[PDB]
Amino acid sequence: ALIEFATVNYFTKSQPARAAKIDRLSRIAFPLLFGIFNLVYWATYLNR
Amino acid sequence: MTTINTHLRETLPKIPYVKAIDMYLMGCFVFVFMALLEYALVNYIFFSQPAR
Amino acid sequence: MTTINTHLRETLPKIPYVKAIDMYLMGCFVFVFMALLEYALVNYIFFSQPARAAAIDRWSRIFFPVVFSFFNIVYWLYYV
Amino acid sequence: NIVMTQSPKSMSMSVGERVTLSCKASEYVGTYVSWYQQKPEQSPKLLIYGASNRYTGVPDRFTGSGSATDFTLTIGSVQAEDLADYHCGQSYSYPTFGAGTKLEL
Amino acid sequence: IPCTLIVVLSWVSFWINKDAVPARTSLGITTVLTMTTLSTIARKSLPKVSYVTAMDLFVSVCFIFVFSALVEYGTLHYFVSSQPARAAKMDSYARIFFPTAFCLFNLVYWVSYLYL
Amino acid sequence: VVAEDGSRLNQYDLLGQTVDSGIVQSSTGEYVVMTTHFHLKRKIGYFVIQTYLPCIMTVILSQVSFWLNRESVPARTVFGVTTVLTMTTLSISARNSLPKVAYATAMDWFIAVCYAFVFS
Numbered sequence: 160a161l162i163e164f165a166t167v168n169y170f171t172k173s174q175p176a177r178a179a180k181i182d183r184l185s186r187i188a189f190p191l192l193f194g195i196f197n198l199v200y201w202a203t204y205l206n207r
Numbered sequence: 208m209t210t211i212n213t214h215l216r217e218t219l220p221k222i223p224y225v226k227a228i229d230m231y232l233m234g235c236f237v238f239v240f241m242a243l244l245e246y247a248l249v250n251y252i253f254f255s256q257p258a259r
Numbered sequence: 260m261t262t263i264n265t266h267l268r269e270t271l272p273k274i275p276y277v278k279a280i281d282m283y284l285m286g287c288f289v290f291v292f293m294a295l296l297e298y299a300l301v302n303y304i305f306f307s308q309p310a311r312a313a314a315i316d317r318w319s320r321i322f323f324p325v326v327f328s329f330f331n332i333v334y335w336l337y338y339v
Numbered sequence: 340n341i342v343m344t345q346s347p348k349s350m351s352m353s354v355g356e357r358v359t360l361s362c363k364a365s366e367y368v369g370t371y372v373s374w375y376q377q378k379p380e381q382s383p384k385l386l387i388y389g390a391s392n393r394y395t396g397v398p399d400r401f402t403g404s405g406s407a408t409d410f411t412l413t414i415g416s417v418q419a420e421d422l423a424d425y426h427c428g429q430s431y432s433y434p435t436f437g438a439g440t441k442l443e444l
Numbered sequence: 445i446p447c448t449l450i451v452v453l454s455w456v457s458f459w460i461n462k463d464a465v466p467a468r469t470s471l472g473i474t475t476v477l478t479m480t481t482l483s484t485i486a487r488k489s490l491p492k493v494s495y496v497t498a499m500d501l502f503v504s505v506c507f508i509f510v511f512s513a514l515v516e517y518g519t520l521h522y523f524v525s526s527q528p529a530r531a532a533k534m535d536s537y538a539r540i541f542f543p544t545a546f547c548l549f550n551l552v553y554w555v556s557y558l559y560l
Numbered sequence: 561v562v563a564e565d566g567s568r569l570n571q572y573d574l575l576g577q578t579v580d581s582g583i584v585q586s587s588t589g590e591y592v593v594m595t596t597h598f599h600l601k602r603k604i605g606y607f608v609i610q611t612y613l614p615c616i617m618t619v620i621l622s623q624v625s626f627w628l629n630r631e632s633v634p635a636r637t638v639f640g641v642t643t644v645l646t647m648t649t650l651s652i653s654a655r656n657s658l659p660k661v662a663y664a665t666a667m668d669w670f671i672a673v674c675y676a677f678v679f680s
């Protein structure tokens with residue numbers, strides 16, 4: 160998350176389209192990945 | 208809030224269930240997190256419409 | 260500075276007199292607090308006089324390390 | 340030196356009433372003040388040792404009340420033979436006696 | 445792991461724009477605070493010894509690196525008012541000089557302390 | 561009697577002894593009990609430098625915020641929140657020393673007043 164913010168700020172004021180695009184994409188990419196990781200972790204550790 | 212919790216837990220033993228003081232700290236932390244989320248929501252829709 | 264003093268004091272007993280490392284930490288905290296108060300003074304008289312702020316900054320830049328080195332030498336001479 | 344102010348300096352009471360003598364020390368003397376009865380032409384006889392403890396042979400009308408500094412001695416229903424000097428003396432330090440109270444009728 | 449991750453946390457400031465002062469100052473100084481706390485823990489692991497080990501050497505080098513990053517940003521901000529192109533080149537110079545120096549130090553340290 | 565160099569009291573200060581004799585009554589009989597009190601007087605030296613100095617310094621640091629300009633919101637906000645966090649950590653740490661008693665000591669009153677000042 161911090162690295163994504165750093166990239167957004169680096170691209171801001173020069174290519175704001177790419178910055179806004181990757182921010183609106185990271186608003187969906189991080190929570191879904193965390194949910195998938197939680198499901199996998201809990202499932203594979205409670206089955207045993 | 209998390210500092211208060213970490214100081215408190217170092218005294219009590221490893222105990223599974225949710226004590227009463229843990230419930231109070233969780234409620235206070237929920238209120239704090241809700242205040243922070245409220246500010247984030249305000250900052251999201253600030254540029255578009257300051258009336259709301 | 261406060262957390263350094265805290266991490267140090269957890270090991271020593273409860274002694275009423277002031278040690279040597281406590282004197283050093285008190286001196287360092289006085290220097291940091293005077294730095295912060297100097298900034299407060301700059302920010303207070305910055306609107307009234309814009310050159311007094313630059314004067315105080317240019318003076319502090321060479322005044323703080325001097326007093327710190329003097330205090331360091333006096334402390335290390337009195338204790339060693 | 341622990342000074343003992345014994346009061347009153349001279350008091351007279353008739354027969355059959357409760358009488359209270361007081362003895363106040365200067366420093367701490369914890370239950371270590373004795374009460375002696377000195378009849379005329381006689382040597383003092385210990386009445387109340389400790390703070391409130393009757394010596395063997397003392398009637399039940401003499402009784403003491405102790406504290407850290409102030410002490411009292413009560414004689415309920417004095418008789419005709421209870422007329423003497425009454426000296427309090429501490430022993431927590433080197434013993435120093437009080438001035439004594441003359442009992443008259 | 446936490447020490448090197450704190451160091452790269454400090455390096456992240458080299459990409460944030462030079463106009464945002466509070467962000468970079470907070471980065472640097474909070475990184476220094478976490479670094480000294482972690483050094484305290486690492487040294488608290490083993491008993492009180494008056495010599496220099498190989499772990500506190502590592503944490504001291506990390507502390508020095510964070511100190512260097514903070515003072516580098518300080519000089520950058522001071523020179524921006526005097527000559528901007530100087531600081532503009534200094535930023536991209538540090539972006540290459542810092543990770544290279546860290547990797548060289550890590551290689552030397554690990555080789556020297558593993559094959560000994 | 562007390563030896564001359566016989567005092568390992570780091571924090572307290574022995575004033576003097578005070579002996580006494582008494583007679584207690586138990587479930588088995590009536591016993592003689594020799595009582596001895598040692599009058600102690602705590603030294604405030606450590607608590608000053610470890611609680612009263614940081615509390616006063618925090619209060620001063622917090623009241624410094626008034627001399628800043630009104631057009632500087634982040635600085636004054638940082639002043640306030642950091643002073644509150646420091647006061648909270650101090651109120652938690654200082655209480656840790658004493659046994660868990662159910663009344664309020666004097667140091668607790670000082671800490672409460674300093675917290676009220678920072679919040680104000």
Ligand SMILES: CCOC(=O)c1cncn1[C@H](C)c1ccccc1
Pocket residue numbers: 260261264281282284285288289609610613614617
């Ligand atoms: C004016 C001096 O300030 C302070 O002593 C002070 C206030 N908060 C913290 N400190 C320093 C760290 C300290 C506290 C206690 C012992 C030694 C050093």
